Design a protein around this ligand. Structure first.
Ligand SMILES: Oc1ccc(Cc2nnc3ccc(-c4ccccc4)nn23)cc1
Length: 275
């Protein structure tokens, strides 16, 4: 109902996909989230179609807001099929699996570049006052040109790897090993807590997808961090990039670099490498 919407009525025509335009292939699964499976689709362009099972006014507004976001390093929304979430197909899947995959071998320069692309995507999102809440390598994806896109947000938001989410008093399922100290304490999320997660993501990139804090159990991470601890420097992580990570994990949220600063600092480090 258009009356239930604000003044975003004129935008509904652009976000809605007619069921005649979309072919969905329920015999080929390309992701399993807690809210539903995602399937190959044809819209002629290749797409990913997300099922939602395991207010309509609010669902449409979320889609309208999301479709307006456009950056080469942010996963776009193609539209909603009245429902089914229609996303661009990502040939190379999520970033964590890609870097753990022994088929491909990114160089250190390639890995830093993935980091830089994430930073640009987050710089965009931050400029729109959008807090991600769940930035991690598992939640970024690569397309056919190996272009990295910040994903897992808006209508695409889900837990795509349940192992890394812990049940809280609140009952909330939280990615504790990617969370800023203050978020673990208050469960509030800010752009500055996204910056903390970004630091962990950089660590993931430089270890080619190692799990962070393996010998720490769940919410004991707060105890671990408060002992005066941070993730160790990976072998092939350049010294200045480790300094960047430590800045992302500053105990004072407001002292952490902006995503704009991260793009600048990382572009510089990236530029020193060949191949
Ligand atoms: O080709 C595509 C496939 C799935 C999606 C949905 C989606 N949106 N955001 C995210 C973030 C992570 C993952 C994901 C998928 C598999 C394994 C681990 C994580 N999926 N995802 C979009 C396009």
């Amino acid at each position: 109902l258009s009356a239930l919407n604000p003044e975003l009525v004129q935008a509904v025509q652009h976000v809605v996909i007619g069921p005649s335009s979309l072919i969905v292939h329920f015999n080929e699964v390309i992701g399993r989230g807690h809210f539903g499976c995602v399937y190959h689709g044809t819209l002629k362009i290749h797409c990913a179609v997300k099922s939602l099972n395991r207010e309509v006014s609010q669902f449409l507004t979320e889609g309208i807001i999301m479709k307006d976001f456009s950056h080469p390093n942010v996963l776009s929304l193609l539209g909603i099929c009245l429902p089914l979430v229609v996303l661009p197909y990502m040939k190379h899947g999520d970033l964590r699996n890609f870097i753990r995959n022994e088929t491909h071998n990114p160089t250190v320069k390639d890995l830093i570049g993935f980091g830089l692309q994430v930073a640009k995507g987050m710089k965009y999102l931050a400029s729109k006052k959008f807090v991600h809440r769940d930035l991690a390598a598992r939640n970024c994806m690569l397309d056919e040109k190996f272009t990295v896109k910040v994903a897992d947000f808006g209508l695409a938001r889900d837990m795509y790897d349940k192992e890394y989410y812990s049940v809280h008093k609140t009952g909330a399922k939280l990615p504790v090993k990617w969370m800023a100290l203050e978020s673990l304490q208050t469960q509030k999320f800010t752009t500055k807590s996204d910056v903390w997660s970004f630091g962990v993501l950089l660590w993931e990139l430089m270890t080619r997808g190692a799990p962070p804090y393996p010998d720490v159990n769940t919410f004991d991470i707060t105890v671990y961090l408060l002992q005066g601890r941070r993730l160790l420097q990976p072998e092939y992580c350049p010294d200045p990039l480790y300094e960047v990570m430590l800045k992302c994990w500053h105990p004072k949220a407001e002292m952490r670099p902006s995503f704009s600063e991260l793009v600048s600092r990382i572009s510089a480090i990236f530029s020193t490498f060949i191949g």
